[PDB]
Design a binder for this molecule. Structure first.
Ligand SMILES: COc1ccc(-c2cc3c(C)nc(N)nc3n([C@H]3CC[C@H](OCCO)CC3)c2=O)cn1
Length: 847
């Protein structure tokens, strides 16, 4: 085969790493996992309905929220069906099927698409339940359909494809031959057997002089028995001299359940600059010329050794147990707590809330305990039956659980999330893949299934993986094998779509990096920008291409005219495009920023948390009006960002009538708003939208501990909606304010200095509801914030950083104590006025 063999050269193109390579493995686990994934891919490609798949309706079973029924006149939604230019309006009921809006139009074969978008209102679902509709209602807008012909399913077609460990009482051991580094103190090697961040045993070698080569040739006997090693155990090898210098890991029980034996030479990872996820990888360093290396031997018998495969209680105790179950994810367990959870494990099994703590009371270094823990997993009914709790589910998937049966039951719980909910957590489920001991895992397969099943999940899963494959040497192989599996099943139609997007953005990067090397901006630089963008619009670049942060959008021709290079430290591009779709109601460009020099992974994590907060507020009928704009990492330290329309900085609004100073004037923003409002009616709404959006960002920003911001990184729209930007900037550099509530903001609210008003009391009372709303999900947010810090921004691990959020969410405190607490934060804002903002001005503009 060849035509079905040049293919892999395209996949290796889309993936961005050569999955067939072997230059950096010490076993066949990746190969075994690729083979492993073939079955779940074809299972799902065969199992998906061709229609619904090709048109990926975007649907939701959650109730239509209150604040949107009130926006429906009376059981009456208006849709505008476009033919050519012969429009037409219809009175449709919220509970109306989409087809039925054809038994009601073919009365005065075909499918309804959305004007300007790749979105289809298809399938048996009430229109109240299509996201694009809900997006229309929320922003008060006519719903436009183009009414045309189905895409053809046939274009989504995929092209044609021994001794039992439990009989070994010998203490386990490993020989350290020694270490070699090509180029350079006293030095030694530390060997740990870890399971799930739990350390089972430790031994070291004697210290030695640090030279180009250091040999010991010692056996290190561990205090743990061969039969007592759990599946997922890591041998963790480290090098000290006290500071840590190099680490590497090796699974002691391989993907085949074999105790691991023989000679191993492993190139090790360095430490730059408390644990992030890179510390956990089974992947060996690819870079050999440079990397410290270690050489070991594992005993090597014949001799394949395969890992095989309730009463009452007092009352002081029960309440002690209840107090433990309740405590938050980050609150530590004493030995005393653990022995208690374990002894009363059966009474602990009735409370799913308890599972994270129960399965952390387990000594995984003991066969018989693990064996009892598996009996525990067989009596799992209460967990199996209870309503899905994503907060619970994520905790079992973090770095604290290495047993795959514990992790599998969390994944079981996820299988019952509707698509919509999958998109909310997708980014973090993919980061959670870094915590899996093995390349092939239930969570890895599950992400594969849900992608292959829904082009929308699938489009994002593509980019999230490609971002990691592009900037993570620790996990690229594994992510490569998951991407590869996904691409070989998405459909040739998707495959061509992904290829377009890749071709375009790769070009644009080149431009970006190139203009970047010429350096505020010279009109020499402004010149080449326009020039290269003209090159592109030629005989390479395809006509259009899906915008990656918003898959429903096709971008077409650029707008050379409007595109610019901005005056940042780095030189990011400000590009704009035409909607490639003629059926577009408007003619506004699609505006996208391109930047090198920031790791955009971190901004992605924050934005997606923001969407989750907006989703938590919808449960309580709150719309705090955030603008979590699109952001997609596409490669090392580089990617794109969506541009929000009709928006300036708050600092620019000040600099407009004070001119680069700090003489910030309390009345300037409310004057800018009135300045841009055609009616005092629109103006009132922009003031209403301000109060919500600003409150919304005070709470979220405060919980996430990124509320103390420079005035240049807070923006607003000509319509009152306020939003923060550039979250990577405070995260990735690290007198104080909790969030940013400034004299100009308060002034817009009807309060001066130390006063009060109907809008400010509206403000405070949206904050309180908001703040309390999030604390109802204290466990969700604590695990997400913790997993965020671990997989996304190293340096910000330590532990002490991770625990900021417990303080913020005020765990333990009762609502009334908590309500008061936030209001006091607001009051720290009223007190400092322009202080910090002025400080941020001196520092960030004058050093
Ligand atoms: C993590 O990296 C980054 C980098 C850039 C942004 C970013 C987002 C943004 C959005 C979503 N919407 C609108 N409307 N603008 C935006 N801007 C503008 C700020 C003012 C600037 O003007 C400088 C001369 O005054 C022009 C660009 C941004 O920078 C966010 N994160």
């Amino acid at each position: 085969s060849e035509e079905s063999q040049a293919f892999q050269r395209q996949l290796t193109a889309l993936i961005g790493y050569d999955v067939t390579d072997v230059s950096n493995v010490h076993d066949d686990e990746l190969e075994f996992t690729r083979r492993g994934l073939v079955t779940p891919r074809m299972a799902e490609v065969a199992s998906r309905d061709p229609k619904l798949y090709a048109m990926h309706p975007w649907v939701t079973s959650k109730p239509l929220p209150e604040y949107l029924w009130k926006k429906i006149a009376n059981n009456c939604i208006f849709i505008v069906i476009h033919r050519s230019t012969t429009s037409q309006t219809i009175k449709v009921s919220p509970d109306d099927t989409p087809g039925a809006i054809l038994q009601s139009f073919f009365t005065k074969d075909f499918v309804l698409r959305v004007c300007g978008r790749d979105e289809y209102l298809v399938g048996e679902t009430p229109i109240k339940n299509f996201q694009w509709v809900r997006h229309c209602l929320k922003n008060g807008e006519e719903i436009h359909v183009v009414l045309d012909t189905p895409p053809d399913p046939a274009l989504d077609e995929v092209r044609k494809e021994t001794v039992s460990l439990w009989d070994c009482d010998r203490k386990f051991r490993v020989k350290i031959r020694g270490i070699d580094i090509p180029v350079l103190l006293t030095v030694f090697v530390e060997a740990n057997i870890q399971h799930g961040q739990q350390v089972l045993c430790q031994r070291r070698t004697s210290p030695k002089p640090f030279t180009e080569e250091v040999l010991w040739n010692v056996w290190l006997e561990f205090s743990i028995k061969i039969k007592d090693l759990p599946k997922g155990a890591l041998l963790n090898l480290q090098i000290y001299c006290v500071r840590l210098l190099y680490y590497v890991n090796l699974l002691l029980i391989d993907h085949r359940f074999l105790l691991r034996r023989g000679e191993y030479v492993l190139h090790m990872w360095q430490i730059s600059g408390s644990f992030n996820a890179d510390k956990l990888t089974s992947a060996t360093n690819p870079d050999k010329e440079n990397s410290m290396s270690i050489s070991i031997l594992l005993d090597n018998y014949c001799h394949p050794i395969a890992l095989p495969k309730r009463a009452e209680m007092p009352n002081q105790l029960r309440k002690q147990l209840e107090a433990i179950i309740a405590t938050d994810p980050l609150n530590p367990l004493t030995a005393e707590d653990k022995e208690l959870l374990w002894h009363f494990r059966y009474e602990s099994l009735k409370h799913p809330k308890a599972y994270p703590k129960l399965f952390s009371s387990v000594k995984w270094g003991q066969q018989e305990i693990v064996a009892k823990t598996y009996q525990l997993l067989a009596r799992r009914e209460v967990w199996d039956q209870s309503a899905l709790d994503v907060g619970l589910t994520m905790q079992l998937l973090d770095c604290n659980f290495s047993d795959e049966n514990v992790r599998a039951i969390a994944v079981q719980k996820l299988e019952s999330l509707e698509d919509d909910d999958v998109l909310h957590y997708l980014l973090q489920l993919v980061q959670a893949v870094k915590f899996e001991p093995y390349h092939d895992s239930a969570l890895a397969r599950f992400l594969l299934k849900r992608g292959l099943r829904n082009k929308r999940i699938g489009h994002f899963l593509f980019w999230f993986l490609r971002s990691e494959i592009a900037q993570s040497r620790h996990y690229q192989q594994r992510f490569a094998v998951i991407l590869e599996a996904y691409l070989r099943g998405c459909g040739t139609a998707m495959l061509h779509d992904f290829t377009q997007q890749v071709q375009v953005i790769e070009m644009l990067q080149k431009v970006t990096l190139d203009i970047k090397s010429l350096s505020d901006v010279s009109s020499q630089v402004i010149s080449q920008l326009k020039q290269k963008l003209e090159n592109l619009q030629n005989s390479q670049l395809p006509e259009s291409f899906r915008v990656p942060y918003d898959p429903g959008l096709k971008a077409g021709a650029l707008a050379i005219e409007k595109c610019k290079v901005m005056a940042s430290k780095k030189k990011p591009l400000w590009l704009e495009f035409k909607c490639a779709d003629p059926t577009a109601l408007s003619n506004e460009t699609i505006g996208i920023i391109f930047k090198h020099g920031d790791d955009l992974r971190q901004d992605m994590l924050i934005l997606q948390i923001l969407r989750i907060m907006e989703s938590i507020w919808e449960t309580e009928s709150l719309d705090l009006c955030l603008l979590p704009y699109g952001c997609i990492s596409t490669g090392d330290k580089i990617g794109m960002i969506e541009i929000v329309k009709d928006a300036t900085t708050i600092a620019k609004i000040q600099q407009s009538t004070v001119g680069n100073t700090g003489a910030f004037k309390d009345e300037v923003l409310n004057h800018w708003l009135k300045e841009k409002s055609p009616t005092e009616e629109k103006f009132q709404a922009a003031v209403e939208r301000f109060v919500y959006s600003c409150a919304g960002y005070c709470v979220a920003t405060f919980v996430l501990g990124i509320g103390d911001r420079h005035n240049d990184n807070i923006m607003i729209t000509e319509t009152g909606n306020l939003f923060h930007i550039d979250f990577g900037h405070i995260l990735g550099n690290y007198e104080r304010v909790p969030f940013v509530l400034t004299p100009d903001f308060l002034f817009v609210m009807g309060t001066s200095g130390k006063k009060t008003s109907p809008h400010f009391q509206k403000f405070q009372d949206i904050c309180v509801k908001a703040y309390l709303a999030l604390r109802h999900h204290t466990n969700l947010l604590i695990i997400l914030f913790s997993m965020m810090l671990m997989t996304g921004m190293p340096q910000l691990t330590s532990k002490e950083d991770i625990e900021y959020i417990r303080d913020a969410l005020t765990v333990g405190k009762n609502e009334e104590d908590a309500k008061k607490y936030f209001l006091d934060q607001i009051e720290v804002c009223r007190d400092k006025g322009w202080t910090v903002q002025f400080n941020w001005f001196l520092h960030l503009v004058l050093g």
